[PDB]
Design a protein around this ligand. Structure first.
Ligand SMILES: Nc1ncnc2c1ncn2[C@@H]1O[C@H](COP(=O)(O)OP(=O)(O)O)[C@@H](O)[C@H]1O
Ligand SMILES: [Ca+2]
Ligand SMILES: [Ca+2]
Length: 375
């Protein structure tokens, strides 16, 4: 029986299996090679992944996400108290431990972060089992390099609740390096990891297969969703101009526009323009418009440039110059943005980016390789 590698990401998760010298990144029931880190509770069902995220506009109070921001933290942790303002779902205190409180089948229920994450891991486990055709019992799960003992244990506990023997908890940047075979080489590797909600820069030194985390930098609240937000605000103003109506206080309309903006953003990574066509956005008014890559880049120019500041800090903390970095590794779904690739490459004076592996799959890819080694 094959062991699996799971990237348990802030906003998306990804599962891979290493068989016959190569990694299969496993598509879910909807054909998606990543799955939202989302759990929704309704009057009749518990939804996980695509089904959960797809009804977020309908059911905001009972659609749980960002469990990774809570996992292994105390309720009184300043990060928890600060983050609670970003969430439409209720977080309560159960003996200095945070629980997400929701309505499920007409009853008030509360879940520990590792319980929510266990449901995401169960989905990823089931996705792998559908592909392999037998039950999976062994997994490597990845965490950020800066995760403490509490956050690592809570992540492992999520795995155990999901019915997995957790072979090892390994660092996300290390998994990304393993995906590119950089573990087999001192080599200095910079991991540039821009996801949906978080930006992580890591400098690893690899010496005879041994990894040392020399520096970690970034922004725990900078991600692709910030770029979506810049598009949302742009189109809210456009709708005001054309229809003399403010949609900003209609939560459903804003969430539906946000979904359309995220889809348009993805198109702008491969095309120089994208069409944004929403039926009945507000008071039965259809919103059919477009966005150029250039305008998108203008709207996010400051946010894109800000990604180089943690790169500068990481190099300074690692006591390394640009030329002393041997390999640049692009990971996280947001690194598909051409302007982000340009900024990093230009900063490193034309150096190649390791980007041949789907950036939102590289961490799961490496986890799958390491899972097979440990088996
Ligand atoms: N082609 C693309 N162009 C731009 N952004 C993309 C593209 N594909 C995915 N993304 C973005 O990647 C982010 C998710 O990154 P991922 O690493 O999968 O998740 P996580 O947030 O869990 O780290 C989202 O903001 C999504 O919009
Ligand atoms: Ca943000
Ligand atoms: Ca990611």
């Amino acid at each position: 029986a094959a062991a699996i590698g799971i990237d348990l990401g802030t906003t998306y998760s990804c599962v891979g299996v290493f068989q016959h010298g190569k990694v299969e990144i496993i598509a879910n029931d909807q054909g998606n090679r990543t799955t939202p880190s989302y759990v929704a509770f309704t009057d009749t069902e518990r939804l996980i992944g695509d089904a959960a995220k797809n009804q977020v506009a309908l059911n905001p109070q009972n659609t749980v996400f960002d469990a990774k921001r809570l996992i292994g933290r105390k309720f009184g942790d300043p990060v928890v108290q600060s983050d609670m303002k970003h969430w439409p779902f209720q977080v309560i205190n159960d003996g200095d431990k945070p629980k997400v409180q929701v309505s499920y089948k007409g009853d008030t229920k509360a879940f520990y972060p590792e319980e929510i994450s266990s449901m995401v891991l169960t989905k990823m486990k089931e996705i792998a089992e559908a592909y392999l055709g037998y039950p999976v019992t062994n997994a490597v799960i990845t965490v950020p390099a800066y995760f403490n003992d509490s956050q690592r244990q809570a992540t492992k506990d999520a795995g155990v609740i999901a019915g997995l023997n957790v072979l090892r908890i390994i660092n996300e940047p290390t998994a990304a390096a393993i995906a590119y075979g950089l573990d087999r080489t001192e080599r200095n590797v910079l991991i540039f990891d821009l996801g949906g909600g978080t930006f992580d820069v890591s400098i690893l030194t690899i010496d005879d297969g041994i990894f040392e985390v020399k520096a970690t930098a970034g922004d725990t609240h900078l991600g692709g969703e910030d770029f979506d937000n810049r598009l949302v605000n742009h189109f809210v103003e456009e709708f005001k101009r054309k229809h003399k109506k403010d949609i900003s206080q209609n939560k459903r309309a804003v969430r539906r526009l946000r979904t359309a903006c995220e889809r348009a953003k993805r198109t702008l990574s491969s095309s120089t323009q994208a069409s944004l066509e929403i039926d009945s956005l507000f008071e039965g008014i259809d919103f059919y418009t477009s966005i150029t890559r250039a305008r998108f880049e203008e709207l996010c120019s400051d946010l894109f440039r800000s990604t180089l500041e943690p790169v500068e800090k990481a190099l300074r903390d690692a006591k390394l110059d640009k030329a002393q970095i041997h390999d640049l590794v692009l990971v996280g779904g947001s690194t598909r943005i051409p302007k982000v690739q340009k900024l990093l490459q230009d900063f490193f004076n034309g150096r190649d980016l390791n980007k041949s592996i789907n950036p939102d799959e590289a961490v799961a890819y490496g986890a799958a390789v390491q899972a097979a080694i440990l088996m």
